[PDB]
Amino acid sequence: PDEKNRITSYGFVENDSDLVHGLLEVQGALVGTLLF
């Protein structure tokens, strides 16, 4: 579809996005082998 069947702005996807963003920020701010 032309993206016609997505489920924008509902419950758990926002929490998942916030959790991933927070995890990424925590990982990046504390970098001061695992990572290339």
């Binding site: 016609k4 069947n5 997505r6 489920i7 924008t8 702005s9 509902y10």
Partner: protein, 48 residues
């Protein structure tokens, strides 16, 4: 303006219910339609 709104509302298989449409409501130089979304969309709790 109102006729175009009504036409593009009623050109669709599953748009909201068109209650009515009034030109110059109470002397104001404007116009208004009333559309009531279907109950399934309310029960869904999200938008597509």
């Amino acid at each position: 303006h109102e006729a175009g709104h009504i036409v593009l509302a009623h050109l669709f298989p599953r748009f909201d219910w068109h209650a009515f449409s009034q030109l110059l409501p109470g002397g104001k130089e404007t116009a208004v339609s009333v559309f009531y979304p279907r109950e399934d969309m309310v029960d869904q709790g999200y938008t597509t």
